[PDB]
Amino acid sequence: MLIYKDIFTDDELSSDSFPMKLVDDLVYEFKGKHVVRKEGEIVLAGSNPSAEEGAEDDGSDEHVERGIDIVLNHKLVEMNCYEDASMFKAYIKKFMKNVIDHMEKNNRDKADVDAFKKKIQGWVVSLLAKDRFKNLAFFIGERAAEGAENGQVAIIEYRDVDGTEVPTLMLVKEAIIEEKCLE
Known part of the structure; x- marks a missing residue:
């Protein structure tokens, strides 16, 4: 059981079992699938109709007829960019402040922390390119969505x-940040 805790999700940090790919030493990349969750249907073979964005019905995190393996199996509900504007903007505010702060706390070197800041700078500036990334989805944890608290917003x-x-x-x-509990 791997226990994950964000610098902002430190409230409801939780435990799962999923492998990840750390790209550029900046972000974890996870592989997903296009699948369906319906109490009376299971048809995910459809290799023809695209998605871009999630669904419309109140299917609930684990029971969304139309979604991705990543979120349906981890219980994550869709939050749309038009409303999440304030939410991710607030998280990025706390994030950027905290990450640079904790980084200069241990490493100090103005040449290194500036390089790190460049990594995340490129990531956010590109990711926030509205008209192209317009078809992105922000999925938040069941606990947070139901508790109205500061749960993790995963970038889909x-x-x-x-x-x-x-x-x-x-x-x-x-x-x-991860807590190792296997053996």
């Missing part, structure tokens, strides 16, 4: 491999 990206369109999850390392 659209990305195809050689043409095969897969949902890619990303989370920032300097925000998400």
Whole structure:
């Protein structure tokens, strides 16, 4: 059971079992699938109708007829960018302040922390490119959505491999810390 705690989700930090790919030493990349959750249906073979964004019905985190393997199996409800504007903007505010702060706390070197800040700078400036990334999705934890608290907002990206369109999850390392409980 791996226990994850964000610098902002330190309230309801939780325990799961999922492997990740740390890209550029900045963010964790997770591999997803396009699948359905319905009490009377299971058809995910549809390789033809695209998605871009989630669904409309109040299916609830784990019971959303239309979604991605990543969120449905981890109980994450969709939050739309038009409303999440204040939420992710607030998280990025706390995040940027906290990550640089904790980084200069231990490393001090103005040449290194500036390089790190450049990593996240490129990530956010590109990610916040509204008109293109317009079809991104912010999925928040069941506990938070139901508790109205500061749960983790996971970044759901659209990305195809050689043409095969897969949902890619990303989370920032300097925000998400892990607790190792296997053996």
